[PDB]
Ligand binder design. Structure first.
Ligand SMILES: [Mg+2]
Ligand SMILES: [Mg+2]
Ligand SMILES: [Mg+2]
Ligand SMILES: [Mg+2]
Lengths: 386, 386, 386, 386
């Protein structure tokens, strides 16, 4: 059989850090996968380079499922952010190889096209309501159909930045943002809000109810969800739609949230949750309960992830929306890709594979630089959820 | 305030790989913690050295809870084998410092002594029933009160070794081991069996029922438990006691298994599940339902973990048993410790701290060497659970 | 081992009755604990002096957990207000000794500091809405961040005083208090209300809904809770936050209220619910469901309890709020302590122990005087819940 | 109205300690009630003498329900062993007065006679199986229809005595006792066993199954029951009948055990659980699920309790059995009573009241002497349940 000859980790920082796995074969064809774990990147580098990659040498890269099961089960210690990023990188690279060998863009292998373009949302941010309202208008004018709106709250504020938070101040202020947005722009546009893990379940229920008159597309990550019962009170009390899951890494993180009908959108991603192989299983479970996909799409997911995400989004029947933050020009140059943006939609191209590659010579000119996600504390100093 | 000046990772292989974190302070006192993750060790090295440790510099090491919450919440991507090993290492080192500063052995700070010695079990292994029966006898003769018995099954068989498995062959053979053990040795000794994740829930129910006449201390890890509902059928159908959790890393992995009364012993460890700080919370939840601790204790948990485990075991009210595999002489020399074994019990000493230290000069003479856990496949080649 | 030489009960009335246990040792170090049970004080005196204390003589006071289990299990008749006050007094005294021996303030032994100051609420009372609104303003002006507001209701009224109650009159009046408070002071301040056990579950649901526009911090003790299902209808029908538990004495009183997510704040105290040892277990169970601590803090909890409560509050991750009623000057003199109040927050000091002591010579100058809590009856004479 | 003039506490030790309340009135009629709480007796003395009794002076003793509610609700701190003993003593004394005033034995006021004699069980104890089998035979020969059988286990062992325990040793031995009893005496006699709180739920399930061939009348107190879910696994796994509740003090301790059909007999008593008034409510809830009464009846319940218990047992429709341990001759002389034993049954007499009185002059000749219940520890020293 054809064999894996190398599984190499490539690190680059063209505006921010990205980690990529390149699986090479004895036939010539290669595939690439994203391994980026924002703020903990080098843990995945080691997991791959020192442990997983040596096991892959000599394996048959056509055996996507077997290799997935080998790395998942064979680890012994199962699941987790680092573990699943490594598995995702392998899986993306193997699907890239499979699609190249089939002479087809990846969405064709998944079951073909279900839709034309992929609806996105962008990020309208402001320091206060007035600034945020202005920002949403600029996104509307750019042709976005859906916009996430986030405001700073008056009275709230190389190593992690420490930010402040106060729930009462936010509960008193956030609903007024959405009131003003609907007064200014009407109800035609999809409006989204990220609760950023800040609220208890009762508080999220309160906030959800206060947001009902404004017909939100979703309220996201309203309360920490390691306990999958945490969404129960929220769902009982509000008809504001709920989303969660960018930080999830396996179906086991979401099975009860889905089966108990506690969420409307699942936000797990190709890189976060174990590749195309595993994300398909999450989306299928979701579909049984009419839960839709809402893949996370911040810049810390490389263009390799975005290419795979768009192939996935183009096929998956229960697609909801795709988050889109634009990468830097330098990032786009390091990772040439066959997808594009037009009038509020992303489109994947027909290049065999997932359509993304990496320019290794150029990537080597942007050295790794440590960078951390911020943390949050309450006014009294209590460590909180950022 | 006193400050952390360094948080250094030390790697050594005195018979097998161990990773240790040493937290140093500007007062002079230091603490150490185990970070060893068998078969994925260097992923934790990177998680600590490249990401967590730089954040700890300048922090007040007296703030154990705050630092735990900072590393747990501040990671953004929560839980997981690598993540929680890093957190455990920090937590052990900080409790070591706290106990040293208090001038007390660690168990005193946890609430003091609940018992004298710590009951252990050892591993009696054989290639067939006859060999396994002989091995159990040797453990009995050595004064062990509790013995795990594992047999090879006739017809079943630097990089991971690939082993074979067949469930029907095992279901036909394993119960006969326990029949023979009770015929030979009677019912005085505690007898344990590790199902090694091999069975479905229905199969584990079947096996559990077949083992009932032999009054086992536990049947462990009978079926994979990422789905916490997996133990439901087993518990419904058998009164053989059930244990699980060496591979768990947070309370979120076990909350339903405990609250639904699906297990008798929780096997999570100080190193696996986030240190003394977090393991206490797991044990307390367990206690509400009369579930007892049965900490895993294989050699891939360093003597630093064993010292912390024994301090924990000496205090915790709902102690059940402690697994004990003896380390090599070289490992014992690299990690001098104040605990000892006598007549089937471990005992922790009175040295302030957790009682363990690391000889860095000696540790440097045993270089890291890659080593992997085995994997298992069914007879047709299907990737399985080892 | 070091031994308990005496466990002495001290009674004093420096403005109101307090009972204190002092555990003395053969090394010299001693510890003190609160045993005060308002309106039934001498039952605890007897429980301790005639029964528990003689068993403690000769025990090793370092064995906090063992002694807790001995007094809890060994009583045979388990739980209860008198029983648990006795256990709490012992536990506080033993933690006081442990912290003194460690040379650390108590919060350090619990896991260290999670926050700086401790947010409190005070009691704004009035005979009608106008008077109550004035009182809340005075608390705001004094720098309180949180205020409990209680009003008399027009038409409602050495041995226990008999008070009157009528639910319909209150349901028609209480919501107007919170309407007026928000009209007058806005939404910046945390506003609390104690329902004083007066309502049925349906009535509490009704009241909770009527209070929703006013964004309360909590509605407390809305309905009697011996039946832990009593909060179910309330939680189903309102997003007003719920608190309960000042009269609870073990985790068994609260486990279902917590696990079924029926409350936002648990109000159990160090003295009410079995000391630091047991209150930690309650707080930890609460944390799994994002339930926060809201310890009761009326004057019938002595400064010994307040010191322990503040050490607990300084460490506990899921802190919510601390009730604060100021003791008399005479009480403060009898129980010198290292905690203080500034701008709406309490702060614990660094004195080893819980930081509180008792001046026995001064305490002896204020003799015990019987005093009872009031009772309540409905308009027709029916015995009710005060 | 007629008034309570005194409510006096009388203490005596005619072989063991008893506490009695005597309520006197301005008409002349008086009533007495048991307040005995074994091993904590003087806590109830204080609760009554220093707190409750002064509130009763001047009340109308005909108002049994109102006084019950006053002492129960008015305490503020609700339920508990000490609290409920005090309430029980009052309630018994008031029912005694009511029956005297009606000119009827107490059972007539409860609803009249449902049966003739009251089936009892006695205690056959032995140090080993042979001795226990002999003891059961002596009870059979004395005409007992029902016998509790308790054996010591080989290998198991003024201040509380410390006893030993080991679960595995007992699980290996106890079933053989019942095997031998059925071999020797056949199946005609009711055979009972008290598990003495020693087992976990899984262990109790195991034991229950092992006892099935021997057709026990009940297995009692198999596992601690503060968590009312503790009986769930036991009930799921065995058809051996289950009993619990001698240590319960309110219906709130038993409501879920009853409604979830986890027990066959409720063992709460007139003295333990708040008098005739409250025990009636427990028995009625039990009856809905065909659960029967099995009142505890050890010697630490005075003849005042036994008289009330027998009046209750004579009326209650869902009577199951009454425990009977004979008091000393001296105890019988101090508490003259109208009940008697014949051929395995107790009978209550027709004396108006509950039929019991106290000879105060004689009682004064037997002074109080401290005496404690034993405690139990596991072999390693762990504090356990006696
Ligand atoms: Mg987000
Ligand atoms: Mg194992
Ligand atoms: Mg209150
Ligand atoms: Mg009993």
């Amino acid at each position: 059989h054809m064999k894996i000859t190398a599984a190499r980790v490539i690190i680059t920082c063209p505006g921010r850090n990205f980690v990529t796995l390149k699986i090479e074969t004895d036939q010539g064809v290669y595939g690439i996968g994203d391994a980026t774990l924002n703020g903990r990147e080098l843990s995945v580098v080691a997991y791959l380079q020192e442990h997983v990659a040596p096991c892959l040498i000599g394996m048959d890269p056509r055996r996507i499922e077997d290799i997935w099961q080998y790395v998942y089960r064979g680890a012994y210690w199962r699941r987790g952010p680092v573990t699943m990023r490594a598995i995702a990188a392998v899986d993306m690279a193997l699907w890239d190889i499979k699609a190249k060998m089939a002479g087809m863009p990846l969405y064709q292998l998944l079951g073909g096209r279900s839709r034309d373009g992929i609806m996105v949302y962008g990020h309208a941010n402001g320091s206060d309501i007035a600034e945020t309202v202005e920002a949403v208008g600029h996104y509307i004018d750019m042709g976005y159909k859906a916009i996430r709106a986030q405001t700073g709250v008056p009275g709230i504020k190389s190593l992690p930045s420490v930010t402040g938070w106060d729930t009462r101040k936010a509960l008193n202020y956030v609903p007024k943002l959405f009131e003003e947005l609907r007064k200014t722009y009407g109800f035609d546009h999809h409006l989204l809000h990220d609760g950023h893990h800040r609220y208890t379940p009762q508080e999220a229920a309160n906030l959800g109810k206060m947001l009902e008159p404004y017909q939100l597309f979703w309220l996201e990550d309203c309360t920490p969800a390691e306990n999958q019962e945490a969404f129960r009170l929220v769902r009982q009390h509000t008809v504001t739609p709920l989303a969660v899951g960018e930080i999830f890494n396996t179906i086991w993180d979401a099975k009860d949230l889905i089966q108990n009908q506690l969420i409307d959108y699942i936000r797990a991603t190709v890189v976060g949750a174990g590749g195309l192989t595993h994300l398909r299983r999450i989306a299928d479970l979701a579909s049984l309960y009419q839960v839709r996909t809402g893949c996370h799409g911040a810049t810390d997911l490389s263009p390799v992830t975005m290419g795979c995400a768009l192939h996935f989004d183009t096929w998956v029947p229960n697609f909801g929306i795709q988050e889109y933050m634009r990468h830097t020009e330098e990032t786009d140059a390091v990772f040439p890709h066959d997808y594009w943006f037009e009038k509020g939609e992303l489109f994947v191209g027909e290049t065999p594979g997932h359509g993304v590659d990496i320019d290794e010579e150029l990537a080597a000119k942007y050295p790794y630089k440590p960078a951390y996600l911020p943390v949050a504390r309450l006014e009294d100093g209590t460590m909180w959820n950022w």
